[PDB]
Each structure stands twice: as structure tokens, then as C-alpha cells.
């Protein structure tokens, strides 16, 4: 009756009057340990089952996790180990902790001890924690292909040093079949698609569940009608940036679905329209207002234009002062010799289309530059990472998810806004829509390409952009895996060519 | 009884019901002259004695001076001169009148006639006022060393033309011993440290007392890339943002003259919260609404290089050497400002050949120097002069000091902005109390500081930047007009710091 | 003899008959190169050794250099020891020291690239990259030129040069160049051309490394009057008599100082012989030739201004408006002795006699109580043009003679015009009857030229240029404030009867 109420309080996620009910339980015969192991955990189990069915959204799971967190905190003085220990780390060179920290929340509030070592953790630091704590498994996380090769190298090191403990790998670029191939290196390695697979693996490994998981041709790219003149050549900084203006360019469906994990599949269209207006849209307004007042988004842009030319399959970047070739980008071509990014750039020493010899930088034009490439790096600073880490540490799990996702999509909004500003500076903006819904058709002249996209997939090519721009100027650095630190930061090549578009290689 | 009340009204500084008491005094046998010379002056004397003891703050002295000002103004119709006449001037090329105008307030409200000629007054204009008014003394004021050499030249001129009347000198750079040496030129010359020494001298000279009183840098890890090369303007800055960067202890103690000497730490904490902090909030709010602070910035970055003991500034268009700064060295060949700059034609640290302006790099530029000039416009000078003219002496001191420290706050704020633009801000403090002194990469050196004391070097900065673009000019003594204005060199080098030559 | 005769012909310095002897040497076995490297150079080396001893005068060294010059010129129709880039520094007009280094090094076998006068460091180093020399040679007279040499070394070290730099100059000492090795390690001092030869021989690899109660002046009282000038302002005088100017030459300054005839290595009988035989005939020849051909062009810019002392400054007032145009600050002797300002009446001081009657009205009302004479004299660009023609054609002895003559005739013109200023001013009446007595300073007042101890700052010539307009007699100031052309000098002319020459130290 009371125990059913405490079990309901987890599932529905009802904070207010929890401490009154727990106080009544202990004086009516029940022990603090039996409340945690009995009704509070039983609710947390059914939260995970409802997520497996597709009946419960991810923000309500973290609201359920918060009730368990508060329930244990109030029961800590009165009590007078857990199911098992997990060492958990994002791999060397990798800055992304959202996937990992969701694994920390679900496993901790399902009873397991979780040692979270943080981001950019070398294998030596990981295995020092293995010997200190003596866990039932290690958990390794990483976003992109370079991080997956660090995971491989960590397994090579682990097999060589003589470890045989279970290793759980999670990652976007990582697939199930690739982890099966890594069992050539390290036999006791397992793939986890999400946190709840990580929970199943740990239950199977520790001995609380039976072993099942642990068992045509493209149209020709012509000449552009002109090469447009930029306002300047070089790279410049913009800092005075209005967050209310930036907020207008957010992909709200990418925020609400992609980052926060509200869903239309397990609900009706009436309940979707309700869920956005009731829950999601008020959080957006709250975070925007709070971010303006407190100042935990710090919008900055490093932007510029360089004289360029195609030579062969390479794009050459020339110095606007000296005309010396600073960098060479080689982009991949589609199979059967289709489209490449270099097809949008004019050949070196080619006959000018109009009056580009009047305004192209003198030495770069004499060295053969016949085109211009826009470059932008945008960031919201280290401040949103600092704010999210404070919310995580204090145990506000729902607000951690909300602030992380908001910070991701506000950085993308700043990239969208600045791309529009680059087009206006360019003189290619006059075919844009004034309103933002039409920009999600890609309704403008040219395109924006981030490194890691299909048409320019090598994240190493960010290093060339850093040498050209100087990422330090807006507080941004590259890791050993060429990811941007802090994570709320994204760079792009900006292409004027009217035929330019997104395309894949396969 | 009534005369004790009028004497109390000066000392405590009680305005309301003064006019009623003075009306009662004249119909009870007392003449208007004897009220001024008797009880009203007796209060003003004891105000000065309490200041000598360290028992009374400077704002309350000016509140006491206001009571005398109103008392004389109401007694002007009932009369149809004074203890003596003073001609008073800030010297040619000099813009600073706070020291002078405090001498005007104390001497005027101690009975003396004061002819205030204003700022930038040549000796010919001073001596025309001497012949018109026939004073007991001349008063000459000036801030820095170039102004003291104008004072010397004025004394040479005066001795040669055959004047022998007393000359009172005041100034920051002026010392007691230097004025004693100027008696080789002009025997009747006297030093005044403050207004009350000026009062003692005038009392002695006019015949109430006997005549004389007197008295190892390594390489930087990189050269950072600036946002641009050249100069830009920023206008319409947020005064509420600027207000956060004020040195409040420099305002409250340094400019306004509240003190912890003579009081307890309980009464200090009271005095700040009760009196000082409400004046700050009142002046800030009023300055925003009325618009008597006009925050403007002229700022820029230039390609530079060290050759010997000179810093060369190169054109970002042509690469021609525009200006050469020679900075002083510490005694026994210690630190100089040039030690923070890379040598001309020196081997690049990283990629500076790629982005440094082409001709300046070919002419040998290997480094970048930030420059800023900040101002609050002529508007605060105009506002202070209106408060002075109408007789609100306490509000004159408050608005002057506020205007000085808000200009310095704007310099502090913009230095932070220069660091953010330059890419060197990521070691800055989250709080503003840490920003005073170091707490950031590099340093800001204003002309007239110990590390670069020659005010002539501002002329080179004016030719580079164009000070006229934000309403600022240089005088014959190279001071910035209007006075609520300061320029600095901004140095990126992480080992940069404040130092003296001596 | 064979080849001892050609070696003798350089040393004793007999030009005419050389081509016959050189023709006889070839076809008796000897090659043209071996004659130059063997006996002709051997004589040129012993000429320099005799000059080091003090046994041979400098005119005979250049006569010996001429024999080598003609010997090589005749052997030109049918490389050397090393290359030298040679320049007088930016702002400096004096090339006699440099051009003597050019004569001795060229006739000792070395290639000399003479860049000329007022050469910036960028122009010097363009010649370094073109010719690829074994050393650079930098020349300059006065202290401002030595600071340009310092700045050139700073620039050179910074741009990454390490090739030997030889400095020569009057203001330069040996210890100062040792201190410049803090800036540029491979820098060397050369006292004369023969030290420059030794350095170059060592650098090029033809010699081993060795080089590589104070008495107090009387108080200045008031003058008996301020004399009235002919006018206030500035005027030009041209077409002066060179025969008249010739009378005022310091012959001992010409013969010893400029031409380099000497005693000490000779007796007093041989001195009296050497003046009468060699020196005095050259003076008469150059004077007569200068009159006929016209390669001295004597010109004067001269004037008088209302002045007054204020403090340690002399103020110059406008004779039209009475505005203070310029302020001159002169140095004082140690222990507060004499200064040039002590000869000028104080500003606003009580008139001595009738000066209020004739002093310009506004300048007197602004406080002018005294008058300052100013003169700038020149012999034109013509003597520089004449000397350069003698140098180019290879008449090295006549180059030295015409240079020295031109220097001392300009000083003579300054002496003559000072006398004329005294006559115009009304202070000439008690002048010296003879010119020997004029060297004892037997006249009223004194003449102070810029660079002398009483007014040493050459910057103060700029004030005089703004007043007078130096362009009126073809004269300009350089960035080092030297007068271009070099045969030109300015002076302040002081009426005061107690005025005299004094040093500061």
C-alpha cells in the first residue's frame, strides 16, 4: 500500500512528498536496504521495460532516475555493496560524454557502482582504476572512426598486458559486426547500442540474468555565373552575438526528437502537438532566458575567405598576403568517377569569368588563384560544458539532458545563422528565404560542408583549417583524434557554387 | 546663541532654515559683514581644523563651504572686496582643474576674492588679470613635469618683466624642494600641497600671520593573430557593464576623500554602505538617463618589431616604418617595454609569414601591438562645470571623481575586450576584483606611467590612430583634451607586468 | 735594373716614362699580372710602411698611387685580391676619408665598390648581394653619423649578415667599436686607410690574424651699447673676390691639417724648404685656376634679428610681428661658468642708450633688447664637382689638394664675411691691421659656428634655416643636420666686446 506508492513515485516520477512517505515506511517495520532493493528498484525496472516497449520517453526515465537518487540520499543517514562495479570512460582524444553519462545514470539507479573516469582517458588511467576497484566490467565510449581505432588499440594493450575482464564498447561509428571482429583481438568484448543494453550485459555478467547477449551518373558541374567578391581576405573574429537572434535558427525537431528524445511513434498526433507545447517548448524558453541572464552560452565566430584553386583532385589554399600555397585538401570522389567537392572550384591559372583580377589578392592571383572559399568555426565556449557538468554532479539528470541538447542545437543554430551572414557578405544571399522553415529545404545559393560529412569525411583535415584560421582565437583546440574541444563547437567549408549540394560516396 | 547656531550650521552643514536665521540676525543689531567675518568664518575655520586633525572627510568640507556660499548670496542685496584678491589659473597646455577649483572653493568661502581664469591660460592672459584686479597673489596649477616647466618659464617671464607679487604653485609632479630651487628665478614663490596650505599662505600674505610657510624576458610561445590590422571605432557602450569594472576604493578614498584614518572598521563599513555606495548608484542612473557620460573607444593593431632599444611601428598597407618608440630602461640595464617585442627580421615562431601583412613582414615586422584610446566625451566636463558654477560643490567633487573612475573602468573593460578579440583571454578571471593588477595574459601601459612616462609619445599614437575620430585632441603639453580620456599600449606577452624605472 | 726600376718608380713617384719601362719588362719574360703582383705592389706596400714610420708625406703617397693607376690602365688592353663595398652613411656628406680608402685599396689590388655619400643601409646591402664582398666599409665624420653606423649594425645583425664591417671616422674611437661588438661581433675600427688595408689583407687571406681649485672666467658685464644693424631680416651677396678671400686663409691649417705635410719626421730647415718648394706654389696655382675656370663660387646668406635672453634660452623675435620664432638653448661651462646667452641682454631689460628708437616696434614691445648677427657662407657645389672629376680621371694628388683648398677657402670666406658683418654693424673700428693678428682674435665680438664647444648641437642649424632659408645659396640640411654641399658653414655673430672662444669641459 505504502510500498506500492513508493514504487509508483519512481515510475510516474513524483518528487514532492517522497521524504514524508519514506519516513513513514521505516517506522512501520521496513529496513532502508529493503525499500531500495524492493519497491524503489522495482519501479526503476518497469521504467526500463516501458522504454523497451516504446511507451515512455527519455526525459521521464531521467525524472524516474532522480526519484531513486533523492530516495537513496534521504536513506543514507538512517541505514546504520551493490550488484556490481563498472569502470567507465570516454577514450583518449574524444570529448563526447552524453552517451557515457546516460549509462552512468541508468546503471547507478539500477544498483551498480559506476566509476566515471571522464573524457580523454588513456588506457593506463583506465587499468589503474580496474586494479583499484576490481570491477565486473570496463565500459569504453567514443563517437567517430578515429575513436573506434583507439578502442581497438586499448584492446590490443589489454590482451598484451594479460587482462580477461569483460569490456563493453558503445559508439555511433561502432557497429555490432565490427565488435564481433574485435574478438580476434580481445574475446570478452561486447557491443552496447544504448544504456539499457549496457544494463542487460551487466546483469548477465554479474549473475542476475541468463546469458543471451553475452553468449546512373551525375550531371556535369559547369562554370559558376561569376566568382563573387568577399568583403575581405583573411580570417576575422565576431563576439557581439545576440542569443535571441540565434534562437530563431534552431532546428526544434532536431532538439525535441534528436537530443531530448520525445517521440511521435509511440503516441498519436494529438498527443505529439500536446507534448511539444506542454513540455518541450517551455523548456526551450526557460533555457534561452536563463542562458541570457546567467551567461552559460558564450557565442563566438572565427570566419574568413581564402583565395583557392583546383589543381587535379586537390584544392589548393593560397596565402592572401604572400600567394604561397598554405594547404592542399584532397577530397574523395563518388564510385564510377562521379561528384567531388573539387568540381565546385575553378582550375589553377584558368581564364577569369569576369573582373576577378581587379580584386583577387595580387600574389595569390599571380600564383594561379581563381576562386574563393569561405571558412567558419562557431562555438558557444566552455561555459555550457561547465553548466551541464554542474547539473550532472548535483543529480539533476533531466536538466543535464536538456542543457546538453540545447547547447548542441544552439551551436548548430549559430552555424546556420552565420552561414546566412557569410552569404550576405558574399553577395549570394538574394535567393534566400527571409523565414527559417524554408532554410530547412537548403533554400540558398551554395552549401556548408563540415569535416566528417560523406563528401569530406577525414577529420584530420580540421588540422589544415586550424593552421589557416587559428582555432585558439575563439578558445577552440584539436585533440589527438582531431575532435573540437570544447564539444559545443563546429567548423565548415562554405562553398559559393550554385550547383553545390550534399552527396554520399557509396 | 543665534550666532552659535549660524556657526554650527557651517560645521554640521545644515542648509534648510539658514535664510530665516540670517534674517533674524540683521534685525537684532548685527551688520552683514560682521556675520560673515564673525560666526560664519569661525565655522569654516573649525572645519579646516577638524580636517587637520583627521576628524572630518572632504565631502563634508564642501557641504560646509556650500552653507557659506548660500549665506553670502542671501547677504549680497543688503550690502553694496574681502580679505584679499587671488588670480588663479591652470597653466598653458594643461586640462586638469580639480586641484585649482578646490583652492577656489576654500579661499572664496574663507572671504578672499578668487579670479578663476580656467584651463590652458598663457602667462600674458594671467598678467592681464593681475593688472585688472591688482591681487595679493597669483596661483598657478599643473599636473605633470611638462606643466612644471611651463611654471618655470612663467616665473622667468615674470621676473624679467619686473613682477614681485607672491606666486603659489600647486601640482602632483611639483615637490616642496623644487619650488625652493625656483626661488633662484623668482624669490616670492611658495608651494601649496593642498587647498588648506593655500589658505595659510594667503592669510600670511594678506596680513593675518607672518609671510612664509612653504614646506629576463624569454620568447612568447606564439605571436597571436589580431582580429584585423588598422584602427576601428566603438560607440554606444553599456554604462551598466562599464560600472562593474570600477575600482570603488580608488573612487571612495582616492577621488572623493572618505577615510578609515580617524575611524573604526565598523564606521568604515557603515560609511561606504550609507553614504558612498548610494552616490555611485545615483550618479550611474542619472548619467544613463541624462547622458553626461558618452563612452567611446578608438582601438587597433599594428605590425611591429624591435630594432635595438627602439620599437618600430610598420604600416599594414605599405610596410613603411611610420613611428619609432624609444622606451626607458631600469637602472643597471634592467627591464624595458621593448623587451616584450620580437626582433626585426627574427626567425618566425610559427606561421606568422602566412598572415602578417605582406610588405610589413618583408620590411621585417615580427610582432603585433594593440593600441586603445578610451573617453567619456566632453559631456562630463560640461556637467561638472555646471555644478561648480551654480555652487553645488559636493556634487562637483562626486561627478568629477565618478567621471575619472568610469573612464579608467572603460579602459579596464576594453582591455578585456582586446584580449578576447586577440585570442589571449582564456586565462582571465571570472570575477572583476582579480582583474585589477595581473590576472590575465599581458599588460596595458598608459603614457605617463613609470614604464613609459614621456607624454610626447602620445603624438605618435595620434598620428597612427587619429584621436579626433572620438573627439580627443593633444595640447601643447601632450595631455588629452577632454581630460576624461586615456590611451594605452596593449602588450600580448605573458611575462608583461607593471614596473618602475627608479 | 729589371723590375727594381718599376718598384722604385712607384715609391719615388715618377709617372712620365712608365709605359716605356713596362713595355721593356714584357718580352724580357715577365707577364702583366706578375708585374702588378710583384714589383709594383711591393713598392705600394713600402710606401705605406714609410707613412707608418712617419718618413713620407701624404701627397707623395697619392703620387705613388697614381703610378700604380697608370701602370694598370696601360695594362688593361692586354679579378684581384678581394671586393670591398664602401659607403658614407645616411645623412653624411664627407667623402675625403672614404675616397682615400678607395685609392689605397684599389692600388693594392682590391676591387672597391664606392657607393658615394648619404647611402642608406638598404642600398649598402643591395651592393653586398650584387658583388659578394669580403667586407663592408662605413664612413662618417660626427657623432650623429656614428649613431647611424650603430643602427646599420643593428639592422645588419637582425637581417642575419655576419660579414666583416670596417668603420672609420673622426668621432669614432677604438673602444667604442669594441662596445659595438655587443650588437655586431665582426666589426673593426680603422684609424686610417693603411689599417683598412691591413684588415682587408688579413680578411682576404694575404696576412696572418692580429687585427682580426678650478680657475673661473670673469663675469660678463653690460656692453657699452647695443649697436644698430644696417637692416633687420636676411640678405644674399654673390660674386665675391677670391683674391680678397685668399688673404684670410690659415695656411698652416691647409698645409698640415688638410694636405698632410709635416715636421717631426723632418728638420726646421727642410720644413721651410717644403712649404716654399711644394705647398706655397700649389696654393698660387689653385687660386689662379679657381679664378679663371670658376670652380669656387663664393656666396653669403647674412642677416640680423632682434633677440633677448630669457633664462638659459636665447629668444629670436620676428622683426615684423614681434612673435618669438625660435629659442636657442646653449650649454654652460662646468661650475656655472660662461655660456653664449651671457652676451645677450635680458628680455624686457632697461635700454642702455637709444635702442627703443630703432629696435623693431612689436619685437621691442614683446621684450627684444639686443641684436644677433647670422651668416651662412658657401663656395657652391662647383668645388665638389671639380674634386669628383679629378678623382674619377685618377689625379689623386690634385683631388687632395683641391679638397683641402676648398675647405680652407670656405673658412677664409667665413673669416672675411665676419669682418664685413663688423663693418656693417659699426663695430669694425678697432679691428686688426694684419691677418696674422686676426688669428689672435683682435676685433670686437666673436663668431660661433655650429659644432664648436660654445654651440655644439648641429640640430640648432634647423632653426637658422627656418629663419634665413638656406636654399637661397644652394645649401640644404641632411637628416644628420650637416650642410650639403660640404664646402659650407654657418655662424652666430656676437657684437659683445667681452665675447671670446671657450670650451665647456
Numbering used by the authors:
A (entry chain A): 663 to 742, 746 to 880, 895 to 1185
B (entry chain B): 663 to 742, 746 to 880, 899 to 1185
C (entry chain C): 663 to 740, 746 to 879, 893 to 1185
The authors write:
Cobalamin-dependent methionine synthase (MS) is a key enzyme in methionine and folate one-carbon metabolism. MS is a large multi-domain protein capable of binding and activating three substrates: homocysteine, folate, and S-adenosylmethionine for methylation. Achieving three chemically distinct methylations necessitates significant domain rearrangements to facilitate substrate access to the cobalamin cofactor at the right time.
We selected cyanocobalamin (CN-Cbl), a stable and synthetic Cbl that does not support catalysis. To that end, apo-Cap:Cob:Act tMS crystals were soaked with CN-Cbl, yielding a structure of the holo-complex, solved to 2.95 Å resolution and one in the apo-form obtained prior to soaking, solved to 2.4 Å resolution. However, the loop containing His761, relevant to reactivation and cofactor loading, displays some marked differences. The captured apo structures (tMS full-length and Cap:Cob:Act tridomain) and the tridomain holo-structure highlight the preformed cobalamin pocket, which is solvent-exposed and thus readily accessible even in crystallo. In order for tMS to undergo reactivation, His761 and the helix α1 adjacent loop on which it is found would have to reorient itself to bind cobalamin in the His-on, base-off mode, and Tyr1132 would need to swing and “uncap” the upper axial portion of the cobalamin cofactor. Furthermore, the captured apo-Cap:Cob:Act structure would fulfill the reorganization requirements, priming the cobalamin cofactor for reductive methylation.
